[PDB]
Amino acid sequence: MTTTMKISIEFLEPFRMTKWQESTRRNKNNKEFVRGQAFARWHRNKKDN
RNA sequence: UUGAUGUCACGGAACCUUUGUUGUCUUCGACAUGGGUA
């Protein structure tokens, strides 16, 4: 038993997004991935392009 | 397209340094033209 709460966020400013990286590099040892953890994330449909 | 008992990323000024500068009197006299004649 759960209740779903529809959430929308309206940005009043340009928001920051983090650069895409390989799933091999999405760990605490990669500085760039950790530094961008508070930003938005880009999703790739396919890893190649 | 996240994972969860732990995110100061509003935690970080694209910032700092380079002269569109230099040189020149709005001045002034000899031609122009191609043959023609035998």
PDB file of N, CA, C and O (backbone and C1' of nucleotides) in Angstrom, chain A residues 18 21 25-37, chain B residues 9 12:
ATOM      1  N   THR A  18      25.738  18.061 -14.773  1.00  0.00           N
ATOM      2  CA  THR A  18      27.069  17.477 -14.734  1.00  0.00           C
ATOM      3  C   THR A  18      27.368  16.728 -16.029  1.00  0.00           C
ATOM      4  O   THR A  18      26.470  16.211 -16.699  1.00  0.00           O
ATOM      5  N   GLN A  21      29.594  10.614 -17.858  1.00  0.00           N
ATOM      6  CA  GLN A  21      30.783   9.796 -17.674  1.00  0.00           C
ATOM      7  C   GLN A  21      30.416   8.321 -17.726  1.00  0.00           C
ATOM      8  O   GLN A  21      29.266   7.933 -17.514  1.00  0.00           O
ATOM      9  N   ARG A  25      33.475   4.977 -14.201  1.00  0.00           N
ATOM     10  CA  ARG A  25      34.018   6.138 -13.511  1.00  0.00           C
ATOM     11  C   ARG A  25      33.016   6.789 -12.565  1.00  0.00           C
ATOM     12  O   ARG A  25      33.251   7.912 -12.109  1.00  0.00           O
ATOM     13  N   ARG A  26      31.903   6.121 -12.271  1.00  0.00           N
ATOM     14  CA  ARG A  26      30.868   6.675 -11.398  1.00  0.00           C
ATOM     15  C   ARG A  26      31.040   6.165  -9.967  1.00  0.00           C
ATOM     16  O   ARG A  26      30.175   5.505  -9.394  1.00  0.00           O
ATOM     17  N   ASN A  27      32.194   6.493  -9.391  1.00  0.00           N
ATOM     18  CA  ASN A  27      32.556   6.042  -8.056  1.00  0.00           C
ATOM     19  C   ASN A  27      33.250   7.173  -7.314  1.00  0.00           C
ATOM     20  O   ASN A  27      33.583   8.211  -7.888  1.00  0.00           O
ATOM     21  N   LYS A  28      33.475   6.952  -6.018  1.00  0.00           N
ATOM     22  CA  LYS A  28      34.049   7.972  -5.148  1.00  0.00           C
ATOM     23  C   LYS A  28      35.502   8.282  -5.467  1.00  0.00           C
ATOM     24  O   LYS A  28      36.031   9.275  -4.958  1.00  0.00           O
ATOM     25  N   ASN A  29      36.165   7.462  -6.279  1.00  0.00           N
ATOM     26  CA  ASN A  29      37.549   7.724  -6.647  1.00  0.00           C
ATOM     27  C   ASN A  29      37.678   8.728  -7.782  1.00  0.00           C
ATOM     28  O   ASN A  29      38.769   9.265  -7.990  1.00  0.00           O
ATOM     29  N   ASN A  30      36.597   8.997  -8.502  1.00  0.00           N
ATOM     30  CA  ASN A  30      36.581   9.965  -9.589  1.00  0.00           C
ATOM     31  C   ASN A  30      36.166  11.319  -9.030  1.00  0.00           C
ATOM     32  O   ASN A  30      35.048  11.470  -8.530  1.00  0.00           O
ATOM     33  N   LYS A  31      37.072  12.296  -9.107  1.00  0.00           N
ATOM     34  CA  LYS A  31      36.788  13.612  -8.545  1.00  0.00           C
ATOM     35  C   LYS A  31      35.635  14.291  -9.267  1.00  0.00           C
ATOM     36  O   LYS A  31      34.779  14.913  -8.631  1.00  0.00           O
ATOM     37  N   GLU A  32      35.599  14.188 -10.597  1.00  0.00           N
ATOM     38  CA  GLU A  32      34.597  14.913 -11.371  1.00  0.00           C
ATOM     39  C   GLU A  32      33.193  14.413 -11.066  1.00  0.00           C
ATOM     40  O   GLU A  32      32.253  15.207 -10.964  1.00  0.00           O
ATOM     41  N   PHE A  33      33.028  13.097 -10.933  1.00  0.00           N
ATOM     42  CA  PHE A  33      31.715  12.542 -10.628  1.00  0.00           C
ATOM     43  C   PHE A  33      31.240  12.961  -9.244  1.00  0.00           C
ATOM     44  O   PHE A  33      30.055  13.250  -9.048  1.00  0.00           O
ATOM     45  N   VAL A  34      32.148  12.980  -8.267  1.00  0.00           N
ATOM     46  CA  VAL A  34      31.791  13.397  -6.916  1.00  0.00           C
ATOM     47  C   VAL A  34      31.499  14.893  -6.876  1.00  0.00           C
ATOM     48  O   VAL A  34      30.577  15.338  -6.184  1.00  0.00           O
ATOM     49  N   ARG A  35      32.269  15.687  -7.619  1.00  0.00           N
ATOM     50  CA  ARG A  35      32.067  17.132  -7.609  1.00  0.00           C
ATOM     51  C   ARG A  35      30.720  17.526  -8.204  1.00  0.00           C
ATOM     52  O   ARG A  35      30.157  18.560  -7.830  1.00  0.00           O
ATOM     53  N   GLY A  36      30.183  16.725  -9.116  1.00  0.00           N
ATOM     54  CA  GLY A  36      28.942  17.077  -9.773  1.00  0.00           C
ATOM     55  C   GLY A  36      27.712  16.433  -9.176  1.00  0.00           C
ATOM     56  O   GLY A  36      26.663  16.377  -9.821  1.00  0.00           O
ATOM     57  N   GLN A  37      27.822  15.949  -7.939  1.00  0.00           N
ATOM     58  CA  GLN A  37      26.736  15.182  -7.338  1.00  0.00           C
ATOM     59  C   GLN A  37      25.532  16.034  -6.968  1.00  0.00           C
ATOM     60  O   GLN A  37      24.435  15.493  -6.804  1.00  0.00           O
TER      61      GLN A  37
ATOM     62  P     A B   9      25.408  21.246  -0.687  1.00  0.00           P
ATOM     63  O5'   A B   9      26.336  21.981  -1.748  1.00  0.00           O
ATOM     64  C5'   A B   9      26.357  23.398  -1.847  1.00  0.00           C
ATOM     65  C4'   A B   9      27.108  23.872  -3.066  1.00  0.00           C
ATOM     66  C3'   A B   9      26.509  23.469  -4.416  1.00  0.00           C
ATOM     67  O3'   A B   9      26.761  24.510  -5.358  1.00  0.00           O
ATOM     68  C1'   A B   9      28.716  22.688  -4.281  1.00  0.00           C
ATOM     69  P     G B  12      30.563  29.099  -3.181  1.00  0.00           P
ATOM     70  O5'   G B  12      31.869  29.443  -4.017  1.00  0.00           O
ATOM     71  C5'   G B  12      33.099  29.743  -3.370  1.00  0.00           C
ATOM     72  C4'   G B  12      34.245  29.838  -4.349  1.00  0.00           C
ATOM     73  C3'   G B  12      33.903  30.420  -5.720  1.00  0.00           C
ATOM     74  O3'   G B  12      34.998  31.196  -6.197  1.00  0.00           O
ATOM     75  C1'   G B  12      34.820  28.265  -5.985  1.00  0.00           C
TER      76        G B  12
END
